[PDB]
Symmetry: C4
Amino acid sequence: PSAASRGRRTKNWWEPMFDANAPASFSVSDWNFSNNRGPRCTLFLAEKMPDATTLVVKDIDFQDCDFQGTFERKIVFKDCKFTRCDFGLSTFSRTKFSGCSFYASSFTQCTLENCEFRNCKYEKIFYSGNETQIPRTLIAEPYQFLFGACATVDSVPQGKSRFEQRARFEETRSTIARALLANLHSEGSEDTYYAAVKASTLSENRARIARALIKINSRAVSFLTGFASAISAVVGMLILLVMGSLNGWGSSISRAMLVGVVAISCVAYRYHYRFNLPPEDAMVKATEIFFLFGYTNYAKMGQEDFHLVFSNALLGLFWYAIAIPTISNRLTR
Amino acid sequence: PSAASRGRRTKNWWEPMFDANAPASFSVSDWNFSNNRGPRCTLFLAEKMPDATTLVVKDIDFQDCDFQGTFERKIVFKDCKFTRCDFGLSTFSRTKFSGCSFYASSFTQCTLENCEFRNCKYEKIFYSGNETQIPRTLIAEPYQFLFGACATVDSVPQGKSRFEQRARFEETRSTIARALLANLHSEGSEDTYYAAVKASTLSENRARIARALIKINSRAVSFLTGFASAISAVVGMLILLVMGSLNGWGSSISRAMLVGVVAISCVAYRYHYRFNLPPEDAMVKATEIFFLFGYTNYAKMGQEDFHLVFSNALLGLFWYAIAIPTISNRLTR
Amino acid sequence: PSAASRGRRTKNWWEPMFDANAPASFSVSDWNFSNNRGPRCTLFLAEKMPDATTLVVKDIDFQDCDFQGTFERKIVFKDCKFTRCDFGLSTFSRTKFSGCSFYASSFTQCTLENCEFRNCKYEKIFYSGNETQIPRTLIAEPYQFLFGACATVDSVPQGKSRFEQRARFEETRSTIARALLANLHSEGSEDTYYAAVKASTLSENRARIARALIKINSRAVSFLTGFASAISAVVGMLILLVMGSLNGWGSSISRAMLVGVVAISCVAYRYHYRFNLPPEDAMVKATEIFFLFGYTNYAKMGQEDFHLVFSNALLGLFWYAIAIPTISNRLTR
Amino acid sequence: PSAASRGRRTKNWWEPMFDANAPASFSVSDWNFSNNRGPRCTLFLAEKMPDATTLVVKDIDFQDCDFQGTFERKIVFKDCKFTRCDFGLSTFSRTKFSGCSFYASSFTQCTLENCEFRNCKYEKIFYSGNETQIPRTLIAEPYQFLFGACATVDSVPQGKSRFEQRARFEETRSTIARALLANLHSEGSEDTYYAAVKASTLSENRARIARALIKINSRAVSFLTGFASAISAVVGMLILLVMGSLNGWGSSISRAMLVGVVAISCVAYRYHYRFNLPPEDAMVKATEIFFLFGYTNYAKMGQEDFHLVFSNALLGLFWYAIAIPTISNRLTR
DNA sequence: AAAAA
DNA sequence: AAAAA
DNA sequence: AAAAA
DNA sequence: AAAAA
């Protein structure tokens, strides 16, 4: 049995598996992997999988394969390889991808209902912010999934440009990251959740940068607004990266306590080395100005240590901004 | 085939498509758009759409048309025009409105399950806070959808008044905005979410104003309470508008940092111009009073700069109120 | 046709409609209300309602009636009266109660899927924290629904006591209020949501008081712990009531601003009347100590106004605790 | 009728009921408990339960029993005992476990849709973070369920180690606790929710400790990083335990107020005893330094009470960190 | 909100 | 985003 | 997590 | 909470 090659592969030039020279026909699989461990140019229909309560597919190297239909029955893909595979036009229910590798494969126009991706590798994968639906899905490695995807730009036709494709893919990734995080609120390990928070913050700021770059490329008012937007996105990248690196992205109060103690110790050492204060109260002055409740007792304009005191207060204010949300997260769920 | 014209069009005077002189009969469509690009006075039944996995409806100008039934099969409306169209008494599942224009069309008594409205224009549309159900719907342009709707008041009968209709539509829009935001928590781009936050805050405050105006119009205790409620809603409009304009409605920490820096710079310039302070520590005094930790070192009642110092402290307090929730939002998801 | 009277009515002495002398048989309704506007001792089965897409039941006075089955078809109850009615053993889907009155009626062992109660009156109704399921339900008047319910205690058998029944009903109401609030996050008007917040806070604290009273009634260590728990619940009742009355239960920043301004004005008037300070800077001292950033400039132990200054600072601290969550709610959704 | 013993019992050595010497065959139950109150080595299929709207199973002592299938019909287990029972390969819908005891029983590969566990005892139970699905489940005793589970280690084969099994079970419990909390947001009593918050915080920190211990056991850079991670997890355990014990894990503002008042009173008593300050303003100095707004009026480096004042300020700062989230929780839902 | 496949 | 079982 | 109606 | 289509 054979079936027509899909327009997603042969016409949609934005797709990772796009091949204008793809064969007109694909073999229709009977889902028998005993004879061939690597299927090629094959269509895997949900109506043709064997009658089983759980189908375990193990160590199969898929290349240039298509999936189609409503996969209601449970499937376990164990250490499978997908290369230029199209999962589009399919609805998987409770499908488990365990240790699988995805290369140049597309998840656009796909529904993954209550599925799981665990210990998977992604490179040059593709998804859609609205047409890659992941209801109750568990992506155990959110950062690798999100940033293992990238827009394919070698088949961009004339009249369209590479840069807009990439910079709109940034927003696409931001949107799907929002969806993935909302999934992970119910589900997954703490580490998976916090990796997802990291990924979604980074993707949101990258999308802001990309949209500002678009507005710049595309009248002087628009150029000024795009430049200001780009600077603003750059600045928010920097601050958010510093804060999340310093507090584990809202996970660990202990790390924030430790950076606070390190900063206080450094300021106290500077007090002791430069202004001849004994350590046992240079530490006290440092923690007194750091937490800002004892600032006015030591700050006097025109004094030698005034700039140092003001810097210590600013460090304390930044540390407050870092530390308060960690406590809020650990105490409010 | 023909069907009776619906009471929603011929009797419900609150509906946008209400026409007491509407024809008694509507033509029943066979959903063939090859011959006629604009259908008129036509009923589109979900039971009569052609057998297709996805029906693409492109460049069709609907006017005075009704939809009815359970549209389970996927429909894509591409650049269609709906004028005085009734979507009521229908349940659409995974319907995509792409680039469509809605004029004087009603979404009351409608269910939109997992639907999408993208790049759409709305004007004089109508919806219901409880009978326009949008489960998992994605409205890509929340502000335009919400504020493109307005109560129809030309057919209000005697004994009812225009003002109450409009001012209860304000609360209606607030309720549906709440629903739309709850949808967008799972879904959509960051920009769509933040536009929805803007729209729902504005709609909530407009509904408060409208209900206060009703309580005024409808005994001296009630008038006093309505007037106080109206002033309170006005005041909350003003503060919420200022704060959300100043922080991107809880989106961008960088903008709040920039307004803080601008305010500090202005106060420091005033210090330098008026009280002869060098810039390199007029800036320091300004940031010292702005963040409030160095207020008492410079504030003295009866001094020339005392009012300026007090204003700088008040500006800093407002800036704290502006900036803290932005950090909370960017660090807590 | 006739059916056996249910054990919920004749045996379950905790139910509001409990009647040990109830007739052995109930008439089985054919759902024809044209002849009789008030049905009595009648069983309304979901399998026997007439074939209709939406059944409108208007101005029907139900008394001692039972409902049973899966009411999949839409029902609209318009201005109906339910007296000692059992909705138990039923699953209603998209049922609308509009302007209905419930007296001594039970919602235990009932599922209300996507239902709506609007403009309804409740008195002596009954529900269960776990067996009254309200998935996606909209209760437009949460406070009246929750506090219109109360445990029936006249049929408590020997060996059980009235007090435990009532004080465990307090926890029951708290649990169902939690469920109702979680519903209203997606849905309903702002006013309904904030009334639900009020109701659920009050119910949680009443349940704490009731459980402490139980632990007291039911060894000296247990009595001490119950007494301490009761005092703690009393104290949290008081503070939560004051804060929510002062800020609209987290709704309106303007009201909190206004109580802040009133308190500052009162303290400033006291300054001006007692310590001879001109108003134009008694106001400034009051706002300087209220926001706590200028406290140490005016506070000196042993001074005449020291107690007043300390009170002004305490008022400011309480006002901070009142006002910060209102800003958080209005800026973070 | 008889059926083959499942590989979960005879092969999966990580399961609590694992018995390599289990009989090859299990009796297939007809679900008649009138004759035998304790079934042994019996398979309970969902297809073979008697035709009933609600099946009440009361006072049945199950031992070495298996459940299998889609239990769509409602089941009430009342005071039943499960010993080495496998609920795996089953999907229960609206199953109520009331007063049941679970010993060495497994919930892996199980779906519990809208189920309820009330007044149950758990010891040596087993579950999976991803394969124990609890959609809309209500676990009335979250702490006992979560910490009544533990990895079975006596059947660990050669080449695998006990320690890794236990320390990965810690993360497993953390993940399922996250799921249980997300369930309890919609549902259950306040006490159940707050017990779940306690359990999930403790489990998250235990999992952090366990993963750090793994990274230590499994090059000097990795050892240093594991040791630092272990110290960080220890520290966060300590702080989170202190804060949640001091504020009821975000439940009760009154308890936080009371610890604040106790600390202030202790510091004031120390002032009065050591530095001869009258009580009526030793209390005022204590509350003035505790809330930090009056710190600089009393703090002077080199004074006798300077260390005490600094300690009082630190106590106040910790109390702020304790108390603010309680107010946030009680005012923001 | 009403209306009512 | 597009596409379209 | 594994396992696999 | 109990109860039990």
